[PDB]
Design a protein around this ligand. Structure first.
Ligand SMILES: *[C@@H]1O[C@H](CO)[C@@H](O[C@@H]2O[C@H](CO)[C@@H](O)[C@H](O)[C@H]2NC(C)=O)[C@H](O)[C@H]1NC(C)=O
Ligand SMILES: *[C@@H]1O[C@H](CO)[C@@H](O[C@@H]2O[C@H](CO)[C@@H](O)[C@H](O)[C@H]2NC(C)=O)[C@H](O)[C@H]1NC(C)=O
Ligand SMILES: *[C@@H]1O[C@H](CO)[C@@H](O[C@@H]2O[C@H](CO)[C@@H](O)[C@H](O)[C@H]2NC(C)=O)[C@H](O)[C@H]1NC(C)=O
Ligand SMILES: *[C@@H]1O[C@H](CO)[C@@H](O[C@@H]2O[C@H](CO)[C@@H](O)[C@H](O)[C@H]2NC(C)=O)[C@H](O)[C@H]1NC(C)=O
Ligand SMILES: *[C@@H]1O[C@H](CO)[C@@H](O)[C@H](O)[C@H]1NC(C)=O
Ligand SMILES: *[C@@H]1O[C@H](CO)[C@@H](O)[C@H](O)[C@H]1NC(C)=O
Ligand SMILES: *[C@@H]1O[C@H](CO)[C@@H](O)[C@H](O)[C@H]1NC(C)=O
Ligand SMILES: *[C@@H]1O[C@H](CO)[C@@H](O)[C@H](O)[C@H]1NC(C)=O
Ligand SMILES: *[C@@H]1O[C@H](CO)[C@@H](O)[C@H](O)[C@H]1NC(C)=O
Ligand SMILES: *[C@@H]1O[C@H](CO)[C@@H](O)[C@H](O)[C@H]1NC(C)=O
Ligand SMILES: [Zn+2]
Ligand SMILES: [Zn+2]
Lengths: 637, 637
């Protein structure tokens, strides 16, 4: 008729080996003492032995204000109707903050089974002394898919933001690191975990900025969960299948985030240099002298897509809390307002102020030229090299529009959102091809449409590469061969001592870039083709310099200095562009094992320094084009 | 020392009124008999009475192969640290499919509390006889936030796809309708629910297509959950707060989906008419006679964004199962392959074949014109009206590109993804303004750039309206006044009997459209401005006809027929364009209470008929422009 019920008084830190059957139920009564100030965490471990296939043990932990219950061997879901089985289950117990200063709290563990044979479990309830996290101290722990871990941080006084950094040494147990408030329960199951709070799938790295304003209890729970499968982290997979051998050893560090002097140090470093250029130029001019809207039209046909998509799409995460959508550099992302990576946006102040200053140069030069025309001298276009500021204006505005088309990319950098930032750098890379060429020929408008078509073709090839973002080896070699063919065909179009010497030093760099693209197989294709863009640009600059050099004229120092400085800055910028060029892989999990701290002035990482050197180098090359054949203001041949 | 444990034998369909305290535990033992063929569902209801604030009851349902456990009064989360409290909790019990043909199965209900005073619950375990769903039979039920319901469907033989339709009568309890397989457990909690399966937040309507290939058990569970708050369905909100009065009365119907004859009936109806046009024209021509890439360049600058974004973004849902992302017409969406709304994509076969046929017309006419030029007659441009097929080619290709720019919108129609489909209809609406105008003037290229700028300005206003998609009343009235100002300014530019009579019938329709835009305040702005586009287009056509009518010439019938037929088809198309024009609101929940069944041939809804009549009307108007001033091939004044 009735069952045996064995009610017994148990203790902490003492393994209990008992056994139950279909007609026995074991009820253990643990107690402890909780204190207002110091907190502690009970963790229950249960482990059946040589378990039979009949019926699981069923465990119930009853507290004053919550009930937890599971069934051991725990069975978790695969993906395509697969089941994984764990002989060993553990959970920490959520307990609401205490009211009294110290009190005694009980809780009972109920073990029962419906299997008609004995089963020998192994209960053990243990106190946790490393529950609370401390600011700046690394701390390790192990957790399988059946043993979700969680710890508790609470902000000190005067810390209004921290950043949680979790880092494992191996890649293929997956994980989720959620950060929730301290209101029980705690969603730390494979299904509950993504319900609230901000989470991040991790493979080797995870980082989450947390702010005090979110949590009125001045604390939060860091919850670490390990997934049954590694598909969502790039891995591959081959009735229940035993999977109790798969741990993950982690390390959690919670350090304070920059307060306010980083912000001002970022502004007062953008403004303190990009205005240095302004003053330098305006003071140089006095010494020297006293000793239509097509770009914006295309940008407006693209902007409402870019602007609306990115603005709406950031808010989606900002209201969701799923940080696997936008591919920031989470170690260096210092949010202001609703902007997550604020520094990745000031870093585009260069392009803006530099395109603007280039325009303000061209304006003055054009009106000076028309005033000198009103002086009625023979140096209209014969004694000089025919002036056409129409394309200089184009460069000076395209730089401005680049300082906006990527400042919107760096709001949710993403797989789809990519081509915005770097494709617009081909346009400005194309114009330098035009003007230089145009600087030796009367009509280029017939080839201007062809240049627009060539840029569109490059963008289409970039789109194709982005579509096959997992580009096969055949994919890579196909582009390799077609680009070598393009180089070989382009060598002919430029046809002596140095005329053919150019080809000696061109094909080698073509091969070198292709070889690195093949061997690295970088996930990024457009930003890789950009490297070829700059390489061709610099080679063309050098070649035109060489051809100008086989005439008995003399280059004035004022542009020669520009050539050398622009070359050196392009030396820097490609370095900081290759440091981050592999830092973007398929899945946000391993697109996160390439992050890195803020390098310069606590606020800017690599990419934020490339957003600087790129603008300064391109401005330097603009001035090179403006002033390169400047000395030829007398010869009318 | 030890507790009282009262183990008792209970029965189904019999309310149990008992009471427990800190030192009593009640264990009820229910049993039943399960059969291989017929299935049934146990549903437990528990209801504490006049509950005190101390400590909840804790309930545990232990079965052979699963453990469920909750705590009554159940407390669920608000949004900003709010708690809602339910004195009444129910759950159905998942039980795995039985092995034997019939067997006896036990399960125990454990009720216990840690409160040191009596608490009077009310247990009741009831069998469910309407667990299994049947194909084609409506069925109702009630469910609060604490009582998640779920039922079981299993496909018959010969049904490889069904569509679940759930429809409530009131709007502000929210819901989630998940559809999962029949492997226990069943995720029917506010946190588990979105873990697997395909779900849909509902307010008044929900529909989910389900296919047999997904489920190897030839069955699935429909799970209905009611949310604590209505924020994610457009509603607004004002220690635990009692919320036990908020039900939701639903109705679930699971009907078979179209097998294959709908698909062929859709193709053989697109091909059976858009080729009727082909044969009609090619046979008309014999009787009558025997009795550069700018559009594609803009489309390519937009396509890789459109193509890549939409293709990637459909797969996101297709691998997620969260159907609150893409705004289909779920009642009419007949998927093929990975395409959800396949019919919404064939419906753009018109634009393709009709733009193509228009081009093939223009080609023949141009070569006929050049051959006639080789005949060396005086009717070069004087005796006729100056021929320039350059813009006719533009229309004939822009229609093709519209049959692709919206056929990609109708893959995940969305808030961001919108402007693709209808903005490209302004371009073709603009060209008809040009050519007609161009048909009376020698130079329009000076105003061609202005027309491009005007279209860009309209697109920018559309983008601004889309950004403020929740446009305020001040927003609407601002556009109202500025558009009336635009109409008043445009009236002057066209300056008699009828010259000023035109203005009498123009401002009235301007006011009428503005008034309907204000009163309805449609969520869609660009597609609303399109109505003004067609209205202005038709008025301009009529006006040019009137001015041609005050000359003593005679319009040939061949274009006059075209005028009248194009007018009537534009009569139809605007009707089907207004039937779906409010069917797109802010949230996918209520963007779903405007769906409707497939109207024509089991396969096409309203919007799929507008994708037809729009193409045919625009093609008709193209031929009107081509043939309108055709008779003037003799007059050289
Ligand atoms: C609360 O603590 C433990 C439960 O783990 C119970 O066990 C004994 O407690 C006494 C002190 O009160 C000590 O002898 C030991 O800590 C325990 N006994 C042994 C043999 O180790 C204790 O009785 C519990 N108290 C109540 C009121 O339940
Ligand atoms: C987590 O990592 C391992 C998981 O196996 C735990 O056991 C250690 O494993 C390696 C090799 O056996 C060594 O680090 C030690 O010899 C093992 N520890 C022993 C035997 O006690 C390891 O203890 C765990 N580390 C924690 C919890 O900090
Ligand atoms: C299984 O069924 C019920 C539990 O609801 C138990 O109760 C009695 O069953 C007998 C028939 O076996 C009938 O008299 C009634 O259905 C129940 N009694 C009364 C007074 O209504 C039954 O004993 C259970 N059997 C076992 C073996 O547990
Ligand atoms: C679900 O709807 C109501 C929820 O209150 C249930 O009760 C009915 O409510 C209205 C007004 O009282 C009427 O339809 C009936 O008079 C009520 N039913 C009664 C008194 O039995 C209703 O029963 C539920 N319908 C179901 C479960 O089908
Ligand atoms: C437990 O079961 C045994 C026999 O199985 C019986 O003698 C005893 O009375 C039961 N109850 C106990 C030990 O409390
Ligand atoms: C502490 O003691 C009990 C413990 O719950 C309860 O009365 C209350 O929380 C506190 N009361 C006093 C008087 O401190
Ligand atoms: C099962 O467990 C009980 C509890 O100790 C034990 O007495 C018994 O011998 C075991 N084996 C069987 C067959 O009951
Ligand atoms: C239940 O408690 C009562 C007193 O509270 C005691 O007399 C009895 O022995 C206990 N056990 C039962 C009724 O099984
Ligand atoms: C039916 O009876 C029991 C019930 O579990 C078990 O042996 C098995 O499921 C079936 N056995 C036979 C012989 O049918
Ligand atoms: C509490 O419940 C028990 C169980 O019936 C009852 O005997 C008792 O009178 C109730 N009240 C108190 C104060 O114990
Ligand atoms: Zn960038
Ligand atoms: Zn459409």
């Amino acid at each position: 008729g009735p069952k045996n019920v064995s009610q017994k008084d148990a203790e902490f830190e003492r393994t209990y080996v008992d056994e139950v059957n279909s007609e026995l139920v074991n009820i253990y009564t643990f107690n402890h003492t909780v204190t207002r100030n110091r907190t502690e965490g009970v963790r229950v471990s249960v482990n059946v032995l040589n378990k039979q296939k009949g019926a699981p043990l069923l465990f119930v932990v009853r507290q004053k204000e919550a009930v937890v219950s599971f069934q051991v061997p725990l069975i978790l879901r695969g993906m395509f109707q697969r089941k994984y089985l764990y002989q060993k289950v553990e959970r920490t117990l959520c307990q609401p903050p205490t009211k009294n200063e110290s009190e005694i709290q009980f809780f009972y563990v109920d073990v029962s089974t419906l299997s008609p044979v004995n089963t020998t479990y192994q209960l053990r309830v243990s106190r946790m002394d490393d529950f609370v996290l401390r600011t700046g101290e690394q701390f390790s722990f192990n957790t399988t898919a059946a043993q979700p871990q969680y710890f508790k941080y609470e902000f000190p006084e005067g810390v209004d933001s921290v950043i949680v950094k979790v880092t494992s040494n191996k890649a293929f147990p997956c994980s989720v690191i959620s950060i929730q408030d301290v209101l029980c329960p705690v969603y730390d199951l494979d299904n509950n975990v993504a319900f609230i709070g901000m989470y991040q799938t991790m493979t080797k790295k995870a980082a989450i900025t947390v702010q005090r304003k979110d949590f009125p209890s001045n604390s939060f729970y860091v919850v670490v969960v390990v997934k049954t499968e590694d598909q969502a982290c790039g891995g591959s997979l081959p009735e229940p299948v035993d999977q109790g051998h798969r741990q993950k050893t982690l390390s959690v560090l919670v350090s304070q985030a920059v307060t306010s002097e980083a912000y001002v140090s970022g502004m007062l470093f953008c403004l303190g240099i990009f205005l240095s250029f302004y003053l330098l130029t305006v003071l140089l001019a006095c010494w020297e002298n006293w000793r239509f809207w097509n770009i914006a039209t295309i940008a407006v046909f693209y902007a409402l897509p870019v602007v609306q998509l990115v603005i709406t799409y950031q808010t989606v995460v900002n209201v969701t809390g799923n940080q696997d959508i936008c591919y920031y550099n989470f170690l260096c992302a210092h949010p202001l307002g609703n902007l997550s990576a604020f520094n990745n946006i000031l870093s585009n102040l260069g392009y803006i102020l530099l395109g603007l200053l280039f325009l303000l140069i061209i304006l003055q030069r054009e009106i000076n030229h028309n005033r000198a025309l009103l002086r009625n001298d023979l140096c209209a276009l014969e004694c000089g090299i025919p002036k056409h500021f129409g394309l200089f204006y184009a460069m000076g505005t395209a730089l401005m529009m680049e300082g906006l088309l990527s400042a919107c990319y760096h709001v949710c950098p993403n797989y789809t959102n990519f081509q915005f930032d770097t494709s617009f750098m081909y346009m400005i890379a194309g114009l330098c091809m035009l003007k230089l060429y145009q600087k030796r020929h009367p009509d280029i408008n017939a080839s201007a449409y062809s240049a627009y078509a060539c840029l569109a073709i490059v963008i289409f090839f970039s789109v194709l590469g982005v579509v096959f973002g997992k580009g096969n080896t055949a994919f890579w070699i196909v582009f390799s061969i077609i680009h070598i063919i393009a180089t070989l065909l382009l060598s002919t179009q430029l046809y002596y001592v140095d005329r053919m010497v150019l080809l000696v030093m061109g094909n080698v760099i073509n091969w070198s870039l292709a070889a690195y693209g093949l061997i690295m197989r970088p996930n990024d294709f457009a930003s890789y083709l950009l490297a070829i863009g700059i390489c061709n640009l610099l080679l063309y600059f050098a070649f035109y310099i060489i051809m100008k050099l086989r005439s008995g004229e003399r280059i004035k120092l004022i542009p020669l200095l520009c050539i050398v400085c622009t070359s050196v800055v392009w030396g820097f910028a490609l370095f900081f562009f290759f440091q981050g060029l592999s830092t973007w892989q398929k899945t946000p999990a391993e697109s996160r094992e390439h992050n890195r701290d803020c390098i310069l002035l606590d606020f800017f990482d690599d990419h934020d320094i490339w957003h600087f050197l790129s603008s300064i180098a391109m401005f330097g090359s603009f001035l090179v084009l403006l002033t390169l054949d400047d000395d030829l203001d007398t010869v009318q041949r």
